[PDB]
Every structure is written in C-alpha cells, then in structure tokens.
Amino acid sequence: MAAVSVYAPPVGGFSFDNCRRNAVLEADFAKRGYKLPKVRKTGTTIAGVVYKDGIVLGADTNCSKIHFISPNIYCCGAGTAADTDMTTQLISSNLELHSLSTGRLPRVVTANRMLKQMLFRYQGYIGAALVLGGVDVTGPHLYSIYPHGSTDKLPYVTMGSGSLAAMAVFEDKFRPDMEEEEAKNLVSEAIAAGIFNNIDLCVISKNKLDFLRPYTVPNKKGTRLTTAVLTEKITPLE
C-alpha cells in the first residue's frame, strides 16, 4: 500500500510494542481487581541420572514434559510453558541444521552451548529451566540449564516442585554406573518421592544408537496431546 510513515524496512524478532502500554495497563487493572491473562507454568518434578551407558530422564504427568532435541538428546522443562517449548524447538531445529551439514549425530555440549547462550542473550526473561541430557561418541552427558544462562554438568539433577525430595532420594541411592533398570527405577522413585504429599521416562542408551553411520533426518510425529434456554436467533450456513 505504501504507508507514508515508513522510511526503513521493518525487521523481525521480538516486538516490544505494548511494553509501556502494558505497564500502565497492568498498574491500572491491579488497582481495580480485573485479572489480565497470565502465562502458563509447568512446575512439576523433572529428574535425570547418568547410568553406565546412557541417561534416564523423567517427569510428572496430564501432559508431556520431556522434549525432543535430537535422536540422542532429550530435554525436560520447568518454568514458563511457552518458553520451554519455543526454546527446545529452536535448539532442535538448529541441531538438525548442524547435524545435516556435519553428517554426524549431535553432541550434548553443542545443545548446552546453544541453550545457555540463548538464555543468556535474553537476560533471564525467557523462563526456561531445563534438564538436558543425551549421549554422543563422548559418552552420556547430563546438564541443567537455568533461565539466566547458567548450566551445571552433573551426574544427577532434579527440578520442579518436588525437587528437594527427589534430590534427597538421589543423594541416598545414586551410584556411578548403574544398569538401565536400576537407573530407571531410581529416577521413577525420585519423581514419586517428589510428588507424594504417572511418570514419563526417557531412556537414551549408548547401545541403542549408532555413531558411525551417516546422520539421516529422523521422522517426527507431534505433541500437545440444570436451566432452560431461549434461542433468540438461528442462522444455518451452506
């Protein structure tokens, strides 16, 4: 149409309009009790351990909190729901581009770097606290990235509401080099101790994963899972 008020071409990214408007509007509404919409949070217990030849990642459930980042890397998220979703999707597509160029299946440190530098870029304003974990040619790696851009490479880690009970269970019963069943039971038990007042489980194992064949794109599927009336008007269409 050619707007008269446009001199330079628009760019992409976050918009930052509505910022001052929302500040004034939220101060005004809070002085009247009007309850603007809020963001969805996903605070639930997420936990992970490294066993001898893999990791086990676990979460509470009715939802699915264990994200996909790579055929060898998976992620659990706590914090703002939209933030964990978008964060993991962006890093998953970046790791697809990386692997599709390199022809190698990704590295967990690459995902950790991407996540921590993206979360550092947005100065804690993206509320994604993650439990990253995967398996490369280097071995099983478990990380815990925090919304401000700080990671922590760990043997076991827990986040969410029951994180203290689950961390207590891990400090009680975690041993280096467990079996797949032992580690699976430990992660389930830590989650359960974190919920009581189902449980998802992701198992990435070194001997279920070939790091010598060329990388090929995986196939993906999807997620997200009286009184009487008086009809004043009716209007069928078509």
């Binding site: 990386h98 160029s101 390199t102 590295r107 440190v109 690459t110 040619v137 790091f211 010598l212």
Partner: protein, 245 residues
C-alpha cells in the same frame, strides 16, 4: 582500479563467458603454481602426513621463518600452496573461524567443517565484484573422533573434498597419478609407510633426492592427535631409512 568491472569474458570475476566459465577463478588456480612448490598429503591407517618442499633461495634469509605448514587449531594442521601472503591470510581466517566454532558449539571444529567454512568464504569471493579469489590451496589434516585421519583440500573456487591422498602445486598431476597407483595396491599404511609414501611421491615427481632441509613434514596420529612438525633429525631419519631400503 578505483571501481567498476573490467569488460571481457576473462577479466572480471562476475562475468561468465559464452561457455559459462569463470576464467578469473581458473587464473587463481594458475596462481597456485606461483611459487614453484608442490605439497603432498597422505592419509594412513591411523595418521595423516603433509609433506611440502622447502626452497630457501637466499643465504641471507633466516630459514626458520620459511614454512608452509601451519597450525590452525591444536589438532588441525595445514600445508598452504600458492601465493605466500594469500596463504598466510587464509590461515589467519581459518584460525579465527575455528575459534568461533569452538565458542559457538562447545567442541573443537572437525576438519571437514573447517574446509567447508573456508570454501564457503571462497565461494562468496567468487560471486562478488569487489573481492577476488585467493591464489592458494589449503590441505588440512586431523584425526576426527570416530572416522580416523582426514585430509581435505579447499581450493580457490570454493570447492572442497576429502581425499585419501592429495597434491597441490606444480606437480599436482604427476603426484596424483603416483598416489593413485600407490593406493590401488594397498592403503593401510601404518605410520612409517605413509611418511615414506609422501616423501617418495615428492621425490619421484621432482626426481630429487631430498635433504632434511629441503622438505617439511607435519603429522597427526591417532595416539598423538596434536599437529606436530618433525624436526630435521626426524626427517633425516626417515630419509636414511628410505635410502637404505
């Protein structure tokens, strides 16, 4: 020089000829021969070896400053063939790009990814009218993680490819024929056999019996992944061991 494009089918980089050929890129390929030096890189069972001529035509010139083997990362080394300043500038660019990769991705750059990055930059040079190709060839070596030794060759056109053995310079065709004949027979050369192969290729296509001061050898090994440049004593040991046989 100021600005514009030279008119002619072989006089600007962004002009095609009637046959769809970029002639300035081919002239850059001829610039690789400016220097009169040949480089051989040979990949073995568990090592990669780069061998280049070391001509120092000056008694007054400090010979420890003449070198064409460079260290890109701690575990990647390259032999540069072509114009000397262009070679050193492309080494500087490869060093920067490798450091950026380690920064962004948290692990050290592979060899194929480094030659791919350098070749992407070279393609950008061939497509734009302000820049020109570099008259140099980069042959990179490294030990990857699970593939093994790697020899890769970027070139002025932006083309790159992995090899089992490759050559650049004046005697590139003669060396390529020599190495083809060698690789058809057997290829699992241990470590000594790869060094002998590289030195024999260089000393056959040049018909020159070498001295430890007329030749440079840089190696990587699976057990010692770090790029290493052999001292004159080590090259002389290899040469005497080749001569006795």
């Amino acid at each position: 020089m100021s600005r514009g494009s030279s008119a002619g089918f072989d006089r600007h980089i962004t002009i095609f000829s009637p046959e769809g050929r970029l002639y300035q890129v081919e002239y850059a390929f001829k610039a690789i021969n400016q220097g009169g030096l040949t480089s051989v890189a040979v990949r073995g069972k568990d090592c990669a070896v780069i061998v280049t001529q070391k001509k120092v035509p000056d008694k007054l010139l400090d010979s420890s400053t003449v070198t064409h083997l460079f260290k890109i990362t701690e575990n990647i080394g390259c032999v540069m063939t072509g114009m000397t300043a262009d070679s050193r500038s492309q080494v500087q660019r490869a060093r920067y790009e490798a450091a950026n990769w380690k920064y962004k991705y948290g692990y050290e750059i592979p060899v194929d990814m480094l030659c791919k990055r350098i070749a992407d930059i070279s393609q950008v040079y061939t497509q734009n009218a302000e820049m020109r190709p570099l008259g140099c060839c980069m042959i990179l070596i490294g030990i990857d993680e699970e593939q093994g030794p790697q020899v890769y060759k970027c070139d002025p056109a932006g083309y790159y490819c992995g090899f089992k053995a490759t050559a650049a310079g004046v005697k590139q065709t003669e060396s390529t024929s020599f190495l083809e004949k060698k690789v058809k027979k057997k290829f699992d050369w241990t470590f000594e056999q790869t060094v002998e192969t590289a030195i024999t290729c260089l000393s056959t296509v040049l018909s020159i019996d070498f001295k430890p001061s007329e030749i440079e050898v840089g190696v990587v090994t699976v057990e010692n992944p770090k790029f290493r440049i052999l001292t004159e004593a080590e090259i002389d040991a290899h040469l005497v061991a080749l001569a006795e046989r």
